[PDB]
Amino acid sequence: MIHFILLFSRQGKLRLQKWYITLPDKERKKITREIVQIILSRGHRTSSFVDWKELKLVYKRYASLYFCCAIENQDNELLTLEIVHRYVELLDKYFGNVCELDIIFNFEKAYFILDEFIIGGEIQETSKKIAVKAIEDSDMLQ
Amino acid sequence: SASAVYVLDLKGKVLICRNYRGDVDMSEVEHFMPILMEKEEEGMLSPILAHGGVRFMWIKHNNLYLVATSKKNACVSLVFSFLYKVVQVFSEYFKELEEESIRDNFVIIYELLDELMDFGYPQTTDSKILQEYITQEAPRPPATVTNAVSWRSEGIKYRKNEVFLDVIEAVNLLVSANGNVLRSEIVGSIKMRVFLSGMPELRLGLNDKVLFDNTGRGKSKSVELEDVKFHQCVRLSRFENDRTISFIPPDGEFELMSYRLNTHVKPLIWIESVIEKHSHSRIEYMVKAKSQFKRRSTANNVEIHIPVPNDADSPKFKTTVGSVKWVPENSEIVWSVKSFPGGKEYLMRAHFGLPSVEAEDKEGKPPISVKFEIPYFTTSGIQVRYLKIIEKSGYQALPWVRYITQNGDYQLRTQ
Amino acid sequence: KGENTSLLHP
Amino acid sequence: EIFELKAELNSDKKEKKKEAVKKVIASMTVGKDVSALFPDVVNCMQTDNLELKKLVYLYLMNYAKSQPDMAIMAVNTFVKDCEDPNPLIRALAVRTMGCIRVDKITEYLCEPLRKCLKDEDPYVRKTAAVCVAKLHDINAQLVEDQGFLDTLKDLISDSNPMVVANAVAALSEIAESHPSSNLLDLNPQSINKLLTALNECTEWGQIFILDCLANYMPKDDREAQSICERVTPRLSHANSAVVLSAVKVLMKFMEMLSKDLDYYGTLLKKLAPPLVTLLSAEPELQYVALRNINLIVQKRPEILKHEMKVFFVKYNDPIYVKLEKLDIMIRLASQANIAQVLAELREYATEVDVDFVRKAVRAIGRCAIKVEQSAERCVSTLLDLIQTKVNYVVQEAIVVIKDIFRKYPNKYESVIATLCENLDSLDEPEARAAMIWIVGEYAERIDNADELLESFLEGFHDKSTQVQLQLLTAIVKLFLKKPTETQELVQQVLSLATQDSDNPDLRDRGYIYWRLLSTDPVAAKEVVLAEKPLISEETDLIEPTLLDELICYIGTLASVYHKPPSAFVE
Amino acid sequence: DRKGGSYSQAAGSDSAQS
Amino acid sequence: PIRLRELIRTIRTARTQAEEREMIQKECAAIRSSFREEDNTYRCRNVAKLLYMHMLGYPAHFGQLECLKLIASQKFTDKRIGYLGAMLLLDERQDVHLLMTNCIKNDLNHSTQFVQGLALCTLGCMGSSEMCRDLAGEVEKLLKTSNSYLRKKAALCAVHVIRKVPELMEMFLPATKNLLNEKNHGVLHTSVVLLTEMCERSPDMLAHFRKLVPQLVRILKNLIMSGYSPEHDVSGISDPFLQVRILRLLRILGRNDDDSSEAMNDILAQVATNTETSKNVGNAILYETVLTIMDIKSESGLRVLAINILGRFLLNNDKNIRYVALTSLLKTVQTDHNAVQRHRSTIVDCLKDLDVSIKRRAMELSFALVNGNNIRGMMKELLYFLDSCEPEFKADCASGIFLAAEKYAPSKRWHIDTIMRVLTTAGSYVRDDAVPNLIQLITNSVEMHAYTVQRLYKAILGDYSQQPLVQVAAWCIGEYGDLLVSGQCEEEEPIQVTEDEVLDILESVLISNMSTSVTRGYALTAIMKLSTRFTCTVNRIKKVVSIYGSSIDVELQQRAVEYNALFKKYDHMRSALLERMPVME
């Protein structure tokens, strides 16, 4: 299960955040700042995997904005990367040429998609079209 | 002993750099930003940084920090004075201090930086004098810099000889939450805008307590200034000998003298405020302002800042005179009064809501600050006696001066 | 800018 | 881009040359490595317009160390420009020659420097004085061979007070790096001549003129009296550094003045208003002023004895100034202003800065320790702060109470009952250990000392080494004082710290305590529960040798950091 | 007129002190 | 009611941090004013603005009751906004989620599939220790339904409840029975995840869940055979998440049984060679299969295939592939330890790699691969790595070296020399906690004391700023002063120890400013013990103890006072309690 997911920009600004662990607000902010500093203080050949606080912090950003995750040391590492790629593809398909500008303005849609896709740090739908159809049906309800 | 004077920005980019000694590599500026971020995030941030054996002592400007790298045991006071002089020169030359002029006025900025300091030792700091040798829109340097008088360019001619003075008062009061005033200091400010023909030698004369005692008139209203700081034009020896304030006024507005003495009188405004803040239910602001100043004086633009709750919403104000508005940006009640006659009494009754959920952390009690500014009122009682304007050619001067009384560090501690 | 670029460019 | 810029710079049109120079300057300032085009701009150097000459000189100075080989094509241009009729052009050429960090270029610049040393133009003289110092810093041997020391010495005794100040500053900089051999010191006549031009020096020249006197050591009171009389007018300067320099000079000269004469009293009386004025400087200079006051406070504390109201920290004061304000108040704290200090500390304890709160607590504790007349007031303030129910404030109050009890525990038995139930659940090692030590040493006014130690014995084997040692000491003291209610407690502590305790120091202490208990419990009362001597408080006053040396280094980095100049320079 | 107090003319010296 | 896009543009228009804070406060003032009026029309915009401000770093404590009120509302947009606010700004420690239980129960029986799904997702994301107690009955009701879109949500809610309440797993056993035949991939994945969570929580359901191993094997075989599918097929791999879940379940099942391992042996063998690892999904599947094979009692051929796959992946230039291979090798350290020695060169080379994670994995593999025969050979490599290690890896390397020396040290003399070298080179990197372990190890060894004492004396005179090394040297001096100096009662020939340098060193350490109050205490204890251990320098440490009895430290002052009292009143009884402490494991 993913302990937390944080979408942070290259400049350090965070565009998305979803933590599955009940932590204090000050503690959560400190953890986010430390993760941003570590990711921002990492090269392009770091393997996209960091063992921070006994958590497999996987960083894989496909654009200026980077992506982060917190997976416990009990599952495979490539699974997190595959899940991140699938989520990015689903968001791009739902939005259509998703860029950084649409992420800030359309944060609610991204949060709804993440909730409908991953719940409690675990996956909810393995397919990529069923989740999109469900999201579209929920949005069309008004 | 600065090694390289550089101008940074809010994003860490160095707007402009000017090495003076070259003993420090230009790449050390990159570590200044992470060091400043670490110091600020840990509470150890200071204007004087230190990148190993190189010290980065600089101040924060309006938009960028003027950081000057140094490696040896250079005088920090000298570096601060040079930075202040550079800021003043930039303000005099450029009406705004922002990144818009740094990237647009580099042609004159580089020349000014090169001419001002050589080898880490500044030589010229007068904006008026420097404007005759470095321009953004070059002849030989003026003889004023070479001559002793480097603050009054010779040959200045005007149709009229009018000098405008400004006796600005700064009423600073530090009143504790118990109702007693701890720090009550009034700092005089004699700012004059001299506009005459030639190079007159002004002979300032006031009713100083020391001067009256020396002359034998130590029985009338005499100003007892604990600290008197004359400008560069004022001769220190003349003042030290027999309290003779003789100096050549500059061309323009400048600070000639700045008196600073303690005040033992009652506050001009007495503020009686109460906080009937219910436990997450409501709040009451029984603020009453009593003017202890003379009735003949009116405090123009009275602004008594009352710090209200940060999370307070839906507030109601029941005042008597003056418009009261709550600014969410500042999180306080702005008791704005246009005209406040002396001896007036304004009563206010605030009432605002509070959320049921308590705040996560304490916010503190900011002090209540009043912004009273009553012109034509000299609290210290110091009055200008004479101004000896002497010129070799010979002319009849028409000096002018005005007394302005305002509130300086007049903060009131909250309960 | 660098923000208007697509996350994956597909 | 690069080719187009090179073509524009290699053109015969001045309108394109100026634009190319501006673009090159902007690219270098914009962060573009334009050092590859240094040879191209070398040809377009001898220009009549001063606007392009300055930019070319700046580019060469910024591109001198990068391409020293390509800089060999500028010596002739510099020599030609060193004779221009315009003083500005000559000054710019002299400044550019000294700014070029080229080993093979400074050798040929000796002749232009010698020619411009005796320049009639004061700007030319100042430029030559600066260039001589720059060359000496770059190459001391070359400067010594050129014989510029004699010319620099004669500069101070000439006209042009700005040029004289510049020459004095250059000589001081050269002697600063010199090994003190062949110093440029002057007799009283030179000091009088410098003082004569001191009143005509500029704002920057005043510092240079006053720095020379910082090295001269007066030998007679008459000379010291004259120096003090001449430096007295410097206290009325609008410049903050000038006032600080004058104060430092007066402090240095006071080492030879006689306190019997009235000159010392007049100097002391005329210095407090200067300190008050300097305390109202900019926030950046506030830290420097506080450091200077702290350095001078430990030497002559009788000057600012009555300056206490101005030491109060303002609401908008910076953190670096707020922290120094507490230290200044503690240094100037006395029984006369004890109530004011306590009131200020009470107001400073209601803020939200954890570091500020800790600093205020430490200052209050130091003031209480220094002055025993306000011990009761400090104890009451600490009790009120503890009752304030603040975790950090509670830890600070516990630490302050523990520190006070070790120093003045004779009349500290009236607060043990209040501290008996003061939310002992705090896990701060600095507060829990202090509370345990207070309970062990003050286990007489608390009837439930054994019960309180029971809660702290649950995790004694894994709490901490210092905490475990303090708990063991408290248990031993309780057993020695009252062994009826702590007979089994002592045995349990010995078993837990001797069998289940793997700490070497802790294990040794437990074994020693067990041996003492099993050898002579009666002797343990006179051995363990003995009357310790008076605790020697850590004096905050600096050593007299460092204070005398720190007196000469005033306004520099060695004074702000409170460290010797050789312990911080690299 | 002018806010902050109208400007007033200043004397030349202490005529009562010679 | 300002729009979300307008608020985002206004926030982006702020440049300075103070200006951004002022704009945020200005917006929050209007938001609070609208909330205090009980606004219900533009409540969604206010909720979105508050959520954006909270995400941007502004407090949102006052906006807690509004989210609860909007949760029990009827508008779909308002309900979604309330659910988002509860998921973001609501947590177990908030203490305001207790009232949300009634709203969740009311929305749990809602006919709409979106409101109920949103409520279930919110409950799963913000499950509390008490909310699941009053919501367990409703969760089980939805788990037995035939709604494919709700089956996954019910499984996730049950898994979250089991994680929060491990004692509630008994109510889920009869609900998940006969649920492995779901056609939908999401339902099957949720069922597999729930079964794995139940197996990992308690072992009582392992026997009940071990009977379905043939069904899981058949499902995995069918998924592998059906390699083409429009949905769940990414990069040529069909249902990578389902395959990963199946591999994890197979690894977690039958790890200590032969029937379970034998049943899934054919599937593991087929997947170990019939999988394409060109893409990242294939590499992840291969790594999961290798981990499952290593964690289960598989056949020798499966182990050989896993070893070959790990060796092939170790040479991959991809940083992620190298990290996965290092993690697999570290996991398969105890199991197949003999076959792991073939990658010693790769492990050594990985320490010099430019990847922090790769370097850490290589160091961990080297530490875990240290045996009783390669310890001497690997000691030089470990020392070289520690000497040229990163600042954050020096302490970890020293700790690993100390652990390896204490575990499989070839000899006491070699182990002692290695520990001394680590202490001398570690400096400020050795943790203070290792000091008690080193002291215990020194006390246990009673055969090598003269050489160790001489080495400690030599290494302590040169430097004293190392707190752990200084403490170790002080403890060694206090324990073996009688052996460090032999026959030093009076003046003798010039030797390394003269009975006076040790006292001067101890006094300097006690009075040195580089003391943390722990090394000073050890030095004081050593000085006190040297009164009986050493008799040549007598009546000299008593003056220092008396002078040191007025120290600022309360504990140090008490120790000095006790030492002075013992020296001045119990001179004959001083040696009666200076016996050597017992040595234990």
Closest Cα in chain D, distance from residue B247 (Å): 12
Q: Which residues are CB-contacts of D168 (< 8 A; sequence separation ≥ 6)?
A: D155, D156, D194, D208, D209, D211, D212
Candidate from E4, E6, E14 with C-beta closest to B385: E14
CB F265, CB F298: distance < 8 Å: yes
With beta carbons under 8 A apart, name residues in chain B contacting F64.
357
Q: Tell me, what DSSP letter sits at residue B223? A: B
In D, which residues are within 8 Å of B80 by CB distance?
A: 240-241, 282, 284-285, 288
Judge whether A140 is closer than 8 Å to chain F, CB to CB: no
**Tokens standing for D424?**
């002992």
Question: Token pair for residue F53?
Answer: 């401000």
* C-beta atoms of E4 and B373 within 8 A: yes
D95 and D130 in contact (C-beta within 8 Å)? yes
Say if the Cβ atoms of F436 and D508 lie within 8 Å.
no
Instruction: Name the DSSP class of B48.
Output: E
Tally of domains in chain F: 1
* Cβ–Cβ gap A124/F242 under 8 Å: no
Return the sign of the alpha-carbon dihedral for residues F197, F198, F202, F208. Answer: negative
User: Contact D282/B84, CB-based, under 8 Å?
Assistant: yes
CB B314 to CB F96 under 8 A? Answer: no
First to last CA, chain D: 43
The answer to whether the Cβ–Cβ distance between D233 and B240 falls below 8 Å is yes
Backbone angles phi, psi at F98, to 5 degrees: -65, -40
Residues in contact with F33: Cβ distance below 8 Å, sequence separation at least 6, in sequence order: B313, B314
Cβ-based contacts of E6 with chain B (< 8 Å): 376, 402
Q: Give the C-alpha separation, D184 to B245, whole Å.
A: 36
Tell me which residue of B165, B169, B163 sits closest to B384, measured CA to CA. B165
Kindly report the CATH number assigned to the domain that includes residue F262.
Answer: 1.25.10.10
Return the amino acid letter for D474.
A
Touching B: which chains, 3+ CB pairs < 8 A? D, E, F
Residue of D nearest to F571 (CA): D527
Which chain E residues touch B219 with a CB distance below 8 Å? none
Experimental method: cryo-EM
Interchain CB distance below 8 Å, D312 and B183: yes
Query: Do the Cβ atoms of B110 and D58 come within 8 Å?
Result: yes
CA angle (F430, F434, F437) in 5-degree steps: 150
B409/D351 CB distance under 8 A: no
Q: Is B109 exposed, middle or buried (0-12, 13-18, 19+ CB in 10 A)?
A: buried
Chains that touch A (3 or more CB pairs under 8 A): C, F
Chain E residue at shortest CA distance from B383: E10
Strand intervals (E) in F186-284:
233-234, 237-238
3-state SS assignment for residue F153: helix
Residue type, F577: L
Determine the residue of chain F that is closest to D464 in CA distance.
F433
Distance from the Cα of D371 to chain B's closest Cα (Å) equals 22
Q: Do C7 and A88 touch (CB under 8 A)?
A: yes
Q: How many D/F residue pairs have CB atoms within 8 Å? A: 84
- Burial class from Cβ neighbours inside 10 Å (0-12, 13-18, 19+) for residue F354 reads exposed
Judged by CB atoms closer than 8 Å, whether chains meet at B205 and E6 is answered as no
CA distance D505 to F524: 10
State how far the alpha carbon of F522 is from the alpha carbons of B347, D79, D509, F526, F577, in Å.
69, 71, 10, 6, 17
> At residue B388, what is the residue type?
K
Q: Say if F414 is an interface residue toward chain A (CB within 8 Å).
A: no
* Å between C10 CA and nearest CA of chain A: 7
Residue of A nearest to F356 (CA): A46
Cβ distance F298 to F307 under 8 Å? no
**DSSP strands (E only) in A2-140:** 2-8, 14-19, 49-52, 55-58, 66-71, 118-119, 122-123
- Using a CB–CB cutoff of 8 Å, tell me whether D402 touches chain F: yes
Residue for token digits 């903060």? B411
Q: Give the Cα separation of A62 and A9 in Å (integer).
A: 11
User: Do E5 and B375 meet the contact criterion of CB atoms below 8 Å apart?
Assistant: yes
Picking from E6, E12, E13, the nearest residue to B402 by CB comes out as E6
Copy the structure tokens of residue B215: 């002359």
Stretch 414-473 of chain D: residues touching chain F, C-beta under 8 Å = 433-434, 437, 441, 465-466, 469-470, 473
Task: Please state, in angstroms and rounded to a whole number, the distance separating the CA atoms of residues F180 and F177.
Answer: 8
Asked whether the beta carbons of residue B386 and residue E9 sit closer than 8 angstroms, the reply is: no
Q: Return the closest-CA partner of residue F392 out of F419, F369, F434, F359.
A: F359
What does chain C come to in residues? 10
**Nearest CB to F61; choose among B328, B329, B360:** B360
Distance from CA of E2 to the nearest CA of B (A): 9
What phi-psi label fits residue D381: left (phi over 0), alpha (psi between -120 and 50 degrees) or beta?
alpha
Selection from B334, B395, B392 nearest residue B366 by Cα: B334
For E1-18, the DSSP string reads --TTS--EE--SS-GGG-
For residue F448, give every residue at least 6 positions away whose Cβ sits within 8 Å of its Cβ, in sequence order, or none: F412, F413, F416
Count other C-beta atoms under 10 Å from residue B351's C-beta.
14
Tokens linked to A124: 């909810």
Long-range contact pairs involving F497-502 (C-beta distance under 8 Å, separation at least 24): F497/F457, F499/F534, F499/F536, F499/F537, F500/F537, F501/F461, F502/F457, F502/F477, F502/F530, F502/F534
D428: left (phi over 0), alpha (psi -120 to 50) or beta: beta
Resolution (A): 9.6
Contact between F456 and F477 (Cβ < 8 Å): yes
What's the rounded Cα separation, in Å, for the pair D241 and D235?
10
F-interface mutation test, from D469, D509, D532, D539, most F Cβ less than 10 A away? D532
Q: Do the Cβ atoms of F550 and D406 come within 8 Å?
A: no
Chains A, F: CB pairs < 8 Å: 155
Rounded to a whole number of angstroms, the distance from the CA of F477 to the nearest CA of chain D is 13
Give every CB contact of residue D8 below 8 A, 6+ residues apart in sequence: D16, D17, D19, D20
Which chains touch F (3+ CB pairs under 8 A)? A, B, D
φ/ψ of residue F439, rounded to 5: -65, -45
Phi, psi for residue D255 in degrees, rounded to 5: -65, -25
Residue F471 to residue F445: CA distance in whole angstroms: 18
Question: Which F positions 48-107 lie with beta carbon below 8 A of chain B?
Answer: 59, 61-62, 64-65, 96
D188 is written with which tokens?
């009283």
Contact F16 B10 (CB under 8 A): yes
Q: Which residue of D has its CA nearest to F518?
A: D466
A141 touches chain C (CB under 8 A): no
Q: What is the DSSP string of B100-128?
A: HHHTTSHHHHHHHHHHHEETTEE----HH
Distance separating alpha carbons of residues F430 and B333, to the nearest angstrom: 57
Contacts of F142 (CB under 8 A, 6+ apart): F108, F116, F120, F150, F153, F154, F157
Q: Quick check: helix, strand or coil at residue B299? A: strand
What residues in chain E have their Cβ under 8 A from chain B's Cβ atoms?
2-15, 17
* Phi, psi (degrees; rounded to nearest 5) at D219: -115, -15
Cβ neighbours of D441 in F, within 8 Å? 554
The answer to whether F319 and A45 have CB atoms below 8 angstroms apart is yes
Contacts of residue D163, defined as CB under 8 A and 6 or more positions apart, other chains included, come to D122, D125, D126, D129, D155
* d(C-alpha F547, C-alpha D533), whole Å: 10
Confirm if F146 and F182 have CB atoms less than 8 A apart.
no
Mutation site for D-interface testing, chosen from F525, F529, F562 by largest number of D Cβ within 10 Å: F562
Is residue D135 within 8 A of residue D113, CB to CB? The reply is yes
How far from the centroid of its chain's Cα atoms is residue F261's Cα? 30
Tell me if A45 and F354 make a contact (CB, 8 A cut-off): yes
Chains A and F touch (3+ CB pairs under 8 A): yes
- Buried b / exposed e over B359-377, threshold 16 CB at 10 Å, is eeeeeebbbbbbbbbbbbb
Contact (CB<8Å) B411/D314: yes
Question: For residue B178, with 0-12 CB atoms within 10 Å meaning exposed, 13-18 middle and 19 or more buried, which class applies?
Answer: exposed
Output the CA angle B327-B332-B337, nearest 5 degrees: 80
* The pair of three-digit structure tokens given for residue F20, joined into one six-digit string: 């951004």
Distance CA D90, CA D79 (A): 10
**Helix ranges restricted to H, F410-500:** 412-426, 434-444, 450-462, 467-484
Indicate the residue type of B197.
S
What token pair was written down for B126?
């007068």
List, in sequence order, every residue forming a beta bridge with B56; answer none if it has no partner: B49, B69
Judged by CB atoms closer than 8 Å, whether chains meet at F36 and B329 is answered as no
Q: Do F61 and B313 touch (CB under 8 A)?
A: no
* Two structure tokens written together for F439: 């002291």
Flag if B360 and F62 touch (Cβ within 8 Å): no
Write b or e for each residue in B120-151: b if 16 or more Cβ atoms lie within 10 A of its Cβ, otherwise e: bbbbbbbbbbbbbbbeeebeebbebbbbebbb
What is the H or E stretch that residue B252 is in?
strand B252-262
- In sequence order, which residues have a C-beta less than 8 Å from that of residue B225 and are 6 or more positions away? B188, B208, B209, B259, B260, B261, B380, B382
Give the count of alpha carbons within 13 A of D566, CB side only.
4
How far apart, in whole angstroms, are the C-alpha atoms of residue D178 and residue D195? Answer: 25
